[PDB]
């Protein structure tokens, strides 16, 4: 015969208890497997990078988030004494607060989720190198699956997505007319957006991760001027029309379309246009003649350091959806100016695109 008060206390406790656990697991992953792996020859630097991945950043962040929860639950002497959900106002308020405050740093998870894509392929190397397999087992004495490296590296991805569930429970135990109720509802919508955002970021990574990687590496003789197009720094992505395409493309497609990405560290343009792997009725092999000319098409990365942006003036301005991204020239290095005339899908899109680009330039200015 548990009262709403009891139920509420339960949820508040589950949230806090599981968070303490998660933080501990997070530290445990760091100490038990990752650090000791750096001091090894098993994996390459790249392989180690896939495993770690902003984890150190994630822990610092998570630790701070936990403190806020710890504090918030202490805004009252003893929850166990409260008999009315109404008596938890202070705590509910503070907890919900923690999510609103951290909602944005939680987007850092999309970074982890992107690299976790490479986790499987790397761990399936233990099946190969007896030496490596040996190390892992050594770190997992209890011979418990829930303690294997794969079990830890999935926890982050599970944890964020649990938050909205816990919140919806607190939500259901509060009067539909109260502010506590309304507040939680705000907390929930927020976190769902976080989740939804992580998902959207993943969808992008699935489709362009490859290209983004090629751009980071292959960095034209440069010694890594950017070296980092993390999904944690993607501020905005949109589809735009390339008005001034090279003669090859332009002469065949009136107005080619590019995928634009505004990262804190650069602006990326990528030509998509997909029409393959369609229509079962088709013969390729080699006697197909046409089709299959080259894997990729057009990609290009403009570092913030050389990124210049001017929104083109129009007769009927405020309605114009055109603007241009410029990859400034370089006397040294011997690199000519590159200009891209891009037409957004709408004035709002242009508004947001430019706002976004200016943003990375503004901040770049700060640091430098």
């Amino acid at each position: 015969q548990l009262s709403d008060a009891d139920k509420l206390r339960k949820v508040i406790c589950e949230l806090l208890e599981t968070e303490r656990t998660y933080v501990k697991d997070l530290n445990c992953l760091m100490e038990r497997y990752l650090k000791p792996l750096q001091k090894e020859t098993f994996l390459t630097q790249d392989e180690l990078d896939v495993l770690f991945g902003n984890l150190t950043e994630m822990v610092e962040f998570q630790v701070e988030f936990l403190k806020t929860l710890e504090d918030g639950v202490r805004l009252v002497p003893d929850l166990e004494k409260l008999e009315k959900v109404d008596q938890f106002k202070k705590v509910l308020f503070s907890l919900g607060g923690s999510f609103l405050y951290y909602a944005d740093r939680f987007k850092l998870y999309s970074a982890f989720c992107a690299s976790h894509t490479k986790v499987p392929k790397v761990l399936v190397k233990a099946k190969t190198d007896t030496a490596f397999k040996a190390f892992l087992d050594a770190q997992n004495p209890r011979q418990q699956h829930s303690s294997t490296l794969e079990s830890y590296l999935i926890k982050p991805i599970q944890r964020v997505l649990k938050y909205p569930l816990l919140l919806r429970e607190l939500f259901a135990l509060t009067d539909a007319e109260s502010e506590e109720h309304y507040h939680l509802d705000v907390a929930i919508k927020t976190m769902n957006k976080v989740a939804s955002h992580i998902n959207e970021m993943q969808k992008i990574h699935e489709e362009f991760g490859a290209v983004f990687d090629q751009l980071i590496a292959e960095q034209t003789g440069e010694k890594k001027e950017v070296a980092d197009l993390s999904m944690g720094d993607l501020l905005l992505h949109t589809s735009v029309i390339w008005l001034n395409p090279p003669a090859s493309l332009g002469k065949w497609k009136k107005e080619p379309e590019l995928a634009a990405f505004v990262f804190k560290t650069a602006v990326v343009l990528v030509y998509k246009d997909g029409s393959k792997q369609k229509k079962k009725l088709v013969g390729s092999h080699r006697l197909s003649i046409y089709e299959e000319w080259d894997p990729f098409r057009f990609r290009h990365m403009i570092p913030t350091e050389a990124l210049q942006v001017r929104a083109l003036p129009s007769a009927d301005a405020e309605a114009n959806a055109v603007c241009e991204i410029v990859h400034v020239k370089s006397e040294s290095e011997g690199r000519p100016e590159r200009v891209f005339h891009l037409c957004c899908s709408s004035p709002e899109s242009r508004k947001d695109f430019l706002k976004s680009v200016h943003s990375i330039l503004r901040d770049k200015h700060r640091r430098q």
């Binding site: 699956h145 829930s146 649990k162």
Partner: protein
């Protein structure tokens, strides 16, 4: 020792988390059903063969089509669940879950678990569904679905009655061994 990692998937509000808790805890949670189920691992013997059964819940990720499959790789058995008193969760087995799991895991055995068994012949539940021109899923239907998606087994259980749980995980393990 050999580890079998089992991932329970399927529509939310089907009983997955409760089911996994009820099982691993040998006791229905009660009035308060926890939301979180940490990764579980325990030694289990089936048909004389000893194994470390690993269980991963998936609550909270059923709506994120790109995050959801991050747990799929290196999985030995999938438990595609669905509420016996929820025709919609049932239909998702063929429309969503099976196609997805198979796409990511071509060779992984699938046990089709039917949950909330105890609510199947519940007056209130049956009337509630009747009010929506609905009816609980019958064993014959569950079995057919199981056959359609080529599941290794079609079981039904109740985290409440705790009946059928042990079976569910044993068959899961057999499906692997």
């Amino acid at each position: 020792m050999q580890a079998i990692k089992c991932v329970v998937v399927g529509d939310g509000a089907v009983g997955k988390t409760c089911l996994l808790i009820s099982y691993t805890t040998n006791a229905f949670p009660g009035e308060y059903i926890p939301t979180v189920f940490d990764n579980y691992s325990a030694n289990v013997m089936v048909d004389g063969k000893p194994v470390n059964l690993g269980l991963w819940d998936t609550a909270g990720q059923e709506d994120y089509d790109r995050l959801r499959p991050l747990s799929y790789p290196q999985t030995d058995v999938f438990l595609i669940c669905f509420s016996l008193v929820s025709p919609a969760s049932f239909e998702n087995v063929r429309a969503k879950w099976y196609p997805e799991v198979r796409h990511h895991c071509p060779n992984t055995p699938i046990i089709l678990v039917g949950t909330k068994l105890d609510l199947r012949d519940d007056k209130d539940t049956i009337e509630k569904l009747k009010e929506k021109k609905l009816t609980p899923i019958t064993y014959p239907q569950g079995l057919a679905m199981a056959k359609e998606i080529g599941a290794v087994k079609y079981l039904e259980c109740s985290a409440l009655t705790q009946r059928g749980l042990k079976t569910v995980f044993d068959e899961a393990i057999r499906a692997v061994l």
